Amino acid sequence: KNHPMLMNLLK
């Protein structure tokens, strides 16, 4: 939900 940097890191 608008968390690009968090999401990518978790990826």
Next chain:
Amino acid sequence: KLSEEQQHIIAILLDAHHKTYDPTYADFRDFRPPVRMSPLSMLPHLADLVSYSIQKVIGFAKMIPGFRDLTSDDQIVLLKSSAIEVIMLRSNQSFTMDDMSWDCGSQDYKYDVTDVSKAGHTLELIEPLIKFQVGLKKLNLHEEEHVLLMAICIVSPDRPGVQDAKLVEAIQDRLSNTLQTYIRCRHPPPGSHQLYAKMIQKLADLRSLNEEHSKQYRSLSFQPENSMKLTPLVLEVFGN
């Protein structure tokens, strides 16, 4: 009484922490130099540490057994709520009771109560933060209990915005059950006595700390000039 799975979990978490946490603190040089003269002089350096710490927390969280099964939205939600609490929790290893300050192996890296103040945080957040560190330090928990506590903190079903409470709860319980079982089997009296309850109490303390930090962050962060010092990761994780 520790299942093979329970022992496996401990091993994974311990491994996850070692990769996630560096005792050397060698990476700290890369942050903007600490400025101790001057309002908000500490904040650039602290923001960088916090940002860096967020990355490390995220990396630990992913390794937690069953955490990956969660939906992206559930993983993101857990981390955003969790992340400040984990930083305070993780930061316990650096924290020293003698000086009452977090020690990172060097005089510049060592962080005073005033340094935290210098970032732009009032004593109401800070005094409780220091007491928490003392009270957690006093437990002298095994590394295994430290790692498990961080994992149980991250996987909280009651975090705000969690789409699927039941799944998160199922993961956490396995970690809780491991921790309880570990203290009984691997922890001798009298230090072990009440340890699970005392640890669970710390999670209640962290919720309080988290809530305070959020209010104080919002006041600091509300100001565009102060918010400008924060890293992009911090704004995303602590903002929204």
